[PDB]
């Protein structure tokens, strides 16, 4: 009893959360391969977090009598020139996700779908936290990332970052 | 480190496990949509388990100096005519995984890759457990799955199976 | 404080929740009378839950300087041809409540009543949970409700459902 | 010590108990193969119990200065047309054991072997409990065993019966 | 989905483990009859251990969709001239069992049956332990077994041997 | 018992592990003398670890009715130009140890010595972990090892690494 | 600091303790091969003890600014005609160690090396314990070691000797 438009938008965001999980997972291999073991462990944990975001959309869709649908997932494989460029990409992905959540909420308002607007609030709030988390990592690299010694400590901080 | 043939079969297996995870995820949606909430909960738990099979291959690739590559995943989306057909498919999928693992083990032997052969034993053993679990569900469905009532109870058992 | 239109839709919703409580109470009598004691126990618990939905609207009206008014309640008394028809009706009632809440939320927006919009989110969220609970009971009845035996078991599940 | 006739009937009974253990073991294989995993688990536990009946006769023979002799055991392998036929056979086997014990008790009396008569009371009493357990399983199968669904539930009960 | 050859080999080893249980049980009567109560108790416990080896093959066969089959079991009855000869026989039985496990593993390799090769590893490892256990008993008898006083202490050590 | 070839390769690997222990021990002195006390502590702990590797082979040889032989061990003493060079040598040594273990596993398979192949699995698995550990130290030195300050921290991390 | 003479005698002594470790280890295999498993265990534990005596010297040398040096270690492999003869050899070795420690102590006095004389007191005291331990084993053997039965008991004792 959601409108088809909203069902699909929700469904697409579910797929986006899935992609993001796999992108973070893939990025963790780049890190491991380039010796950034602590950044690898943060990314792997973050990948798992994103699956949780996926499952939550998946559950909203099944609970409203819909059939979520996992679409083709493009390969997340990429090359990065530095640890710094990899985290620039994570931050831009999180900004895209934020923007798609804003579009979903706007569409929910325009369609007068108050259940979905309310459901989305969890994501509005989480994306705020995500952008702070990923911006703080860029800010660390900016400040201390210009030597191997600096990278070595940031890598250590990443090994346990956000496990409060 | 490892031979090109081994790296490639490992990487392909890691992708098959990822696919399996998503297929179980997708099937649990089919189950919720058709009111089998227990089966859905079991499929969802099992999706997560398959992800850990993926990760263990991912971590062996990275630990051996290689860069695991998550390839494009085909949509797991499908139609099933019955819960029974859906679990037939899970069992076939698990027999395919069993077979690819055995092929990987045999490649390891013939390439004299003892570290890989040893790594794979975890999968040989897990696949023995996977096939019993999925076959036993099919057996439940053969025995008691021909009425709503039976499905009802099987669905309930599935809601806590293997927990 | 609040606009006349908002006070009135709130007050009407408070009365709909009261009615819902009594209707569930009345249905639990139909269930006891027809030997479905489990369904009766579940309906009785749910009647109490609906009363708390009533009270929360009552308390928001009073907290905003208004005097909530319990209007005459129509008799919830009715005949049902089956336990299945009875639960069809509970689900329709819950979809009607969902719809009135969404109308109330929309009125809140268009009146730029942000305190009321915020108060209503508790109901939007509760109604999402109500519809799943009632739909799942209907699904149980579709699957296993066509024999005495199935009803027996469904009745037993209902006796502890959502506790 | 004991008379030749007593030593021999004891030794034969010890072999019948061994055979019974293996027959229950073998039946549990038939049950697993046909998907009755609960019945299989119960048969397997019961096989172990029959082994302890064997051992107690073994230990009485040795304690009385005799050398117990495990004779050749016939293959317990067989085909059954149904789980019901299989449990019919367990019950017949248990009635045969009951009868051989009673013959042994009577031989003990007529040989004025009071130590043996006293030793055998453990078996008289155990056989009373064995026949109730096996008869009750047959009764479950008569009552609810005519559908997949019933078998399903009976199988589940068997998985924890007498534990 | 195991090959018939492997199913039968597994099945035969199951029967061998069963025989061995009954042989140990039978040997314990010889011991009791000849007053070696402690050796009797070790043998009875070992007989139970061998049944466990049987059940494990039995379970692998049922779990792979096969029907294990208990065959005719020959009588284990024998005469022994001494406690020492009885333990020579236990050691040779364990060497036979070891060899049949090696043949089963070789056949598994040749057939490319990696599940069965992996299953058999438990037995490769156990048989290593078994041969040490039974060799140590022969070594005790060799060293201290030549008098009744010696036999009396070895019999006492046997009464609680391998119950760690 | 085992074949002469297997006995000899096992004995030679026992000796290689012993040598490795003493090399780590000697390298720890180089590190102490050049003020890398944390590196020295890690190397001392690892020398003890390699001693356990030696023992497990010694014990397999004795348990199989053989007589292990500790051969003459050449002095492990050497000059290192840097801490980075020393750790490059430890990694090369672990690679050699891994390769010998793989040649031993191979010889076991082709001699059909399944007991030894099984025994060697512990080493296959251990050498996988040894290589990850020693490669990670060289990776730390590569990232952070180019200033006294960086060496200072790596040395700290090494003082408790892998405990 | 440390005079050359002292550094050398200390390093030699480190190497003798390393040799003694390996000799005890090699002797345990002899015991194992001849079925004296309790003796083998004792010697394996004692080879570990000697290694700690090696390490304590190693650390004294490094702590005084020297570079201890592990020299070539000659094969400890030997034939022993009996368990008794093997323990006669361990006793003689321990007397040699005692004597080398006393020569080191004397060298430390002659050279006015009070730090080293102090360091060596651990060894003086230890070697007094070592000699009692290995003498007591020979004394068990001369008393009860002339029958297989006697040997079986001493072997049992050896299996847990010196463990608290």
Domains of chain C by range and CATH?
A: 1-163 (1.20.1260.10)
Query: Which residues of chain C neighbour A106 with C-beta distances below 8 Å?
Result: none
- Name the token pair of C126: 């509760």
> How far is Cα E163 from Cα E32, in angstroms, rounded to an integer?
20
Q: Which residue has the tokens 């973070």?
A: A24
Q: Residue A78 contacts by C-beta under 8 Å, 6 or more apart in sequence?
A: A26, A30, A89
Q: Between the CA of residue B102 and those of B34, E154, G90, what are the distances in Å?
A: 35, 49, 54
Query: Which residues of chain A neighbour B47 with C-beta distances below 8 Å?
Result: none
The distance of F130 to chain G (nearest Cα, Å) reads 23
> How far is Cα C105 from Cα A114, in angstroms, rounded to an integer?
7
Residue F37, judged by CB atoms within 10 A of its CB (0-12, 13-18, 19+), counts as middle
Closest CA to D133 of D105, D158, D106: D158
φ and ψ at A34, to 5 degrees?
Answer: -100, 15
- Name the token pair of A79: 């090359």
**Angle, vertex CA F55, rays to CA G48 and CA E136, nearest 5:** 100
**Angle, vertex CA F9, rays to CA F5 and CA F12, nearest 5:** 140
Residue B65: HSE in the Cβ half-sphere, 13 Å Cα cutoff: 11
Residue B73 DSSP symbol: B
Q: How many CB atoms lie within 10 A of CB C106?
A: 15
Closest CA to B25 of B43, B52, B49, B50: B43
Q: Do C102 and C53 meet the contact criterion of CB atoms below 8 Å apart?
A: no
User: Taking CB atoms and an 8 Å limit, are A29 and B58 in contact across chains?
Assistant: yes
> How far is Cα G154 from Cα G152, in angstroms, rounded to an integer?
6
D31 alpha carbon, distance to own chain's centre: 17
> How far is Cα B90 from Cα B43, in angstroms, rounded to an integer?
10
The distance of E145 to chain G (nearest Cα, Å) reads 8
Closest CA to F117 of B155, A7, E6, E117: E117
- Name the token pair of A2: 């959601």
User: Taking CB atoms and an 8 Å limit, are D67 and E25 in contact across chains?
Assistant: no
Q: Do F43 and F106 meet the contact criterion of CB atoms below 8 Å apart?
A: no
**Helices D114-144 and D83-110 sit at what angle, rounded to 10 degrees?**
160
Q: What are the percentages of helix, strand and coil residues in chain B, rounded to 5? A: 80, 0, 20
D45 alpha carbon, distance to own chain's centre: 11
User: Taking CB atoms and an 8 Å limit, are F63 and E101 in contact across chains?
Assistant: no
Residue F81 DSSP symbol: S
Phi-psi region of F162 (alpha: psi -120 to 50; beta: other; left: phi over 0): left
- Name the token pair of C29: 């009598």
Q: Residue F119 contacts by C-beta under 8 Å, 6 or more apart in sequence?
A: E128, F60
Q: How many CB atoms lie within 10 A of CB C133?
A: 16
Q: Do E142 and G147 meet the contact criterion of CB atoms below 8 Å apart?
A: no
Q: Best mutation site among E116, E124, E129, E138 for testing chain F: the one with the most F CBs within 10 Å?
A: E124
> How far is Cα G39 from Cα G50, in angstroms, rounded to an integer?
16
Query: Which residues of chain A neighbour B32 with C-beta distances below 8 Å?
Result: 62-63
Q: Between the CA of residue E80 and those of C39, D73, E26, E34, what are the distances in Å?
A: 74, 22, 11, 10
Q: Between the CA of residue E82 and those of E35, E86, E151, F48, G152, what are the distances in Å?
A: 12, 6, 11, 47, 20
Closest CA to C158 of C27, C51, C19, C17: C27
Q: How many CB atoms lie within 10 A of CB B117?
A: 24
Q: Which residue has the tokens 């003459």?
A: F72
> How far is Cα D31 from Cα D37, in angstroms, rounded to an integer?
6
> How far is Cα C144 from Cα C157, in angstroms, rounded to an integer?
12
Closest CA to E143 of G38, G139, G35: G35
Query: Which residues of chain B neighbour D153 with C-beta distances below 8 Å?
Result: 153
User: Taking CB atoms and an 8 Å limit, are C150 and B151 in contact across chains?
Assistant: no
> How far is Cα F43 from Cα C101, in angstroms, rounded to an integer?
70
Closest CA to D99 of D22, D20, D13, D27: D13
Q: Rg of the Cα trace of chain D?
A: 17
> How far is Cα F128 from Cα B119, in angstroms, rounded to an integer?
10
Q: Residue D147 contacts by C-beta under 8 Å, 6 or more apart in sequence?
A: none
Interface E-F: count of C-beta contacts within 8 A: 21
E39 alpha carbon, distance to own chain's centre: 15
Query: Which residues of chain B neighbour A75 with C-beta distances below 8 Å?
Result: 69-72
Question: Which of E106, E124, E135 is opposite residue F118, by nearest beta carbon?
Answer: E124
The set of long-range contacts for F101-110, using a CB threshold of 8 Å and a minimum separation of 24, is: F101/B114, F101/F13, F101/F127, F102/B112, F102/B114, F102/B115, F103/F9, F104/F6, F104/F9, F104/F10, F104/F13, F105/B114, F106/B112, F106/B114, F107/F5, F107/F6, F107/F9, F108/F6, F109/B109, F109/E109
Residue E148, judged by CB atoms within 10 A of its CB (0-12, 13-18, 19+), counts as exposed
User: Taking CB atoms and an 8 Å limit, are B150 and D149 in contact across chains?
Assistant: yes
Is residue F73 classed as helix, strand or coil in its secondary structure?
A: strand
Closest CA to D152 of D26, D39, D33, D28: D39
Q: Which residue has the tokens 């860069």?
A: B67
> How far is Cα D96 from Cα B58, in angstroms, rounded to an integer?
61
> How far is Cα C130 from Cα C138, in angstroms, rounded to an integer?
13
> How far is Cα G93 from Cα G110, in angstroms, rounded to an integer?
26
Question: Which of B22, B44, B67 is opposite residue A33, by nearest beta carbon?
Answer: B67
Q: Residue D80 contacts by C-beta under 8 Å, 6 or more apart in sequence?
A: D27, D30, D86, D89
Chain C's closest residue to B33, CA to CA, is C139
Q: Residue E143 contacts by C-beta under 8 Å, 6 or more apart in sequence?
A: G35, G148, G149, G151, G152, G155
Q: Which residue has the tokens 């005084």?
A: G64
Which ranges of chain D would DSSP assign to H, the alpha helix? Answer: 4-33, 37-63, 83-110, 114-144, 148-160
Q: Do A101 and A123 meet the contact criterion of CB atoms below 8 Å apart?
A: yes
Method used to obtain the model? X-ray
> How far is Cα D155 from Cα D132, in angstroms, rounded to an integer?
18
> How far is Cα E38 from Cα E23, in angstroms, rounded to an integer?
17
What single string gives the DSSP state of each residue in chain E? Answer: ---HHHHHHHHHHHHHHHHHHHHHHHHHHHHHHTT-HHHHHHHHHHHHHHHHHHHHHHHHHHHTT-------B-------S-HHHHHHHHHHHHHHHHHHHHHHHHHHHHTT-HHHHHHHHHHHHHHHHHHHHHHHHHHHHHHHTTSHHHHHHHHHHHHHTT--
Asked if chain F contacts chain D via 3 or more Cβ pairs within 8 Å, the reply is no
Closest CA to F158 of F71, F49, F28, F56: F28
User: Taking CB atoms and an 8 Å limit, are D152 and B146 in contact across chains?
Assistant: no
Buried b / exposed e along D71-90 (16+ C-beta atoms within 10 A): bebeebbeeeeebbebbbeb
> How far is Cα E97 from Cα E125, in angstroms, rounded to an integer?
12
Q: Which residues pair with E73 in a beta bridge?
A: D73
What single string gives the DSSP state of each residue in G68-135? Answer: -----B-------SSHHHHHHHHHHHHHHHHHHHHHHHHHHHHTT-HHHHHHHHHHHHHHHHHHHHHH
> How far is Cα D140 from Cα C160, in angstroms, rounded to an integer?
28
- Name the token pair of A129: 């936290």
Is residue D73 classed as helix, strand or coil in its secondary structure?
A: strand
Q: Residue G103, annotated ligand binder? A: no
Q: What are the percentages of helix, strand and coil residues in chain G, rounded to 5? A: 80, 0, 20
Closest CA to B154 of B20, B31, B47: B31
- The torsion of the CA quartet E92, E95, E96, E98, rounded to 10 degrees, works out to 160
φ and ψ at D39, to 5 degrees?
Answer: -55, -45
Is residue F80 classed as helix, strand or coil in its secondary structure?
A: coil
> How far is Cα C120 from Cα C10, in angstroms, rounded to an integer?
10
The set of long-range contacts for C148-155, using a CB threshold of 8 Å and a minimum separation of 24, is: C149/B149, C150/B148, C150/B149, C150/B152, C151/C36, C151/C83, C153/B149, C153/B152, C153/B153, C154/C38, C154/C39, C155/C36, C155/C37, C155/C38, C155/C39
- Name the token pair of E66: 């096969």
What single string gives the DSSP state of each residue in B99-146? Answer: HHHHHHHHHHHHTT-HHHHHHHHHHHHHHHHHHHHHHHHHHHHHHHTT
Q: Residue A126, annotated ligand binder? A: yes
> How far is Cα G42 from Cα G133, in angstroms, rounded to an integer?
11
D55 alpha carbon, distance to own chain's centre: 13
> How far is Cα B80 from Cα B83, in angstroms, rounded to an integer?
7
- Name the token pair of E121: 């590893």
> How far is Cα B162 from Cα B33, in angstroms, rounded to an integer?
23
- Maximum CA pair distance of chain G? 56
Tell me the CA end-to-end span of chain D in Å, nearest whole number.
Answer: 38
Q: Between the CA of residue G112 and those of B106, G59, G99, G115, what are the distances in Å?
A: 70, 21, 20, 9
Residue D58, judged by CB atoms within 10 A of its CB (0-12, 13-18, 19+), counts as buried
Q: Residue E135 contacts by C-beta under 8 Å, 6 or more apart in sequence?
A: E91, F65
Query: Which residues of chain D neighbour E32 with C-beta distances below 8 Å?
Result: 62
Residue G146: HSE in the Cβ half-sphere, 13 Å Cα cutoff: 3
> How far is Cα B30 from Cα B24, in angstroms, rounded to an integer?
10
Q: Do E51 and E44 meet the contact criterion of CB atoms below 8 Å apart?
A: no
C141 alpha carbon, distance to own chain's centre: 19
> How far is Cα A72 from Cα A50, in angstroms, rounded to an integer?
18
């Amino acid at each position: 009893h959601l409108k088809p438009e909203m069902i699909e938008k929700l469904n697409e965001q579910m797929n986006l959360e899935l992609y993001s999980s796999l992108l973070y997972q893939q990025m963790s291999a780049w890190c491991s391969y380039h010796t950034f073991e602590g950044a690898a462990a943060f990314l792997r944990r973050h990948a798992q977090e994103e699956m949780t975001h996926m499952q939550r959309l998946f559950d909203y869709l099944t609970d409203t009598g819909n059939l979520p649908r996992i679409n083709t997932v493009e390969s997340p494989f990429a090359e990065y020139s530095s640890l710094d460029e990899l985290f620039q990409e994570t931050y831009k992905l999180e900004q895209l996700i934020t923007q798609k959540i804003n579009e979903l909420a706007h569409a929910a308002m325009t369609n007068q779908d108050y259940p979905t607007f309310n459901f989305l609030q969890w994501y509005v709030s989480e994306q705020h936290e995500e952008e702070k988390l990923f911006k703080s990592i860029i800010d660390k690299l900016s400040l201390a990332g210009k030597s191997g010694e600096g990278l070595y400590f940031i890598d250590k901080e990443l090994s346990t970052l956000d496990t409060q």
